[PDB]
Design a protein around this ligand. Sequence first.
Ligand SMILES: Nc1ncnc2c1ncn2[C@@H]1O[C@H](CO)[C@@H](O)[C@H]1OP(=O)(O)O
Length: 211
Amino acid sequence: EKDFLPLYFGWFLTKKSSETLRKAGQVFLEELGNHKAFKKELRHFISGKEKLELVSYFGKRPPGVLHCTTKFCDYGKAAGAEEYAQQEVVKRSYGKAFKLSISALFVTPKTAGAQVVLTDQELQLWPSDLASEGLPPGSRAHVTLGCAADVQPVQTGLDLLDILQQVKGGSQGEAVGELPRGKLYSLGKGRWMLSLTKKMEVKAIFTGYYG
Ligand SMILES: Nc1ncnc2c1ncn2[C@@H]1O[C@H](CO)[C@@H](O)[C@H]1OP(=O)(O)O
């Protein structure tokens, strides 16, 4: 017969790095939800002067260890899944330890996440399958921290690219606040970005999740 692939490949953060990044994620949501600049724009965030707690809003969280997905394969069902998995670099990198650089945390009405900036060696593990929005490959790279109730997986990546495209255009604007980890930017349409002063490094293992 034939070997079937994972549900997806990706970098899976270590227990330690997962707990650090998860904790920073919640603090950001707590800080953002309580920031005056965010409350001003709540009507651009939800359709519903009360306060919204974003930890609650992003109720659908990764339950185990956080991860940075590369190729979603659906056991080979997804286009290009087999071609991605058959690559040498993928087979060679399987079970290898990597360090991922987090450059920012972001929030939209649909998802909450951390932006990952991949190295050139890590970029070799990015699927070529990934409308381009004139951004370099790997721009979508991220760790999901939370999702709104009716949101489906893929949306976090889309949300990030939209944001990075807005930043690209220079329409990110002056910062609207300073948080302990960096500057907060209001991109409108319920979109928010914390640019980390110091990029956060997390340890991960590249491997396949079967579920
Ligand atoms: N097209 C797709 N369908 C389902 N999951 C996808 C996907 N593309 C990427 N993924 C990722 O696969 C994992 C399981 O669904 C999720 O972490 C998701 O990343 P996400 O964090 O943006 O949701």
